Symmetry: C2
Subunit: 96 residues, 2 copies
């Protein structure tokens, strides 16, 4: 009986999507966004609400640190960005 | 970038545990039990609240049909048991 024990989770309805291995941000997926306290396996906990389709910081990003999505630098943090925070556009200087 | 896309689900907190392949019931896992409408990947939807540690019907079980856990017949349904229902003891005749 023990060879094939099965534990089945309740259908998942919230996710993040991380495109490239080097990325330090991911996209939030879930109807009206995800609330603070949302946990991900890996230790990630959202520290504020993040709208659907917006970016979450996968790690602490220091002020002026590279923000990386699809494996490219997409900008630099204006101020330090706590892991699990919403990456709002006002806090990103574009590369130029 | 596309070789290693990753979708990560919110940490699972509710489950059922099915011990043997032939079982038609499983144990519900989650603090104060699981409410009606709880969905599992496989099509299972709970039709009523089921306390933690109690059994859920994985399939429709006809009246007098075998109830199977750990791959043994553990009893027979007194009345037909809808898929996703709580297997309460009052509705099971023991094998003898």
């Amino acid at each position: 009986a023990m060879a094939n024990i099965k534990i089945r989770q309740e259908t998942p309805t919230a996710f993040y999507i991380k495109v490239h291995d080097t990325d330090n941000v991911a996209i939030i997926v879930n109807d009206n966004g995800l609330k603070a306290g949302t946990r991900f396996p890996d230790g990630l906990e959202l520290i504020e609400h993040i709208p659907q389709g917006h970016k979450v910081a996968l790690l602490d990003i220091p002020a002026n640190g590279e923000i990386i999505r699809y494996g490219e630098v997409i900008g630099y943090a204006v101020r330090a960005i706590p892991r699990g925070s919403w990456i709002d556009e006002s806090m990103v200087v574009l590369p130029e």
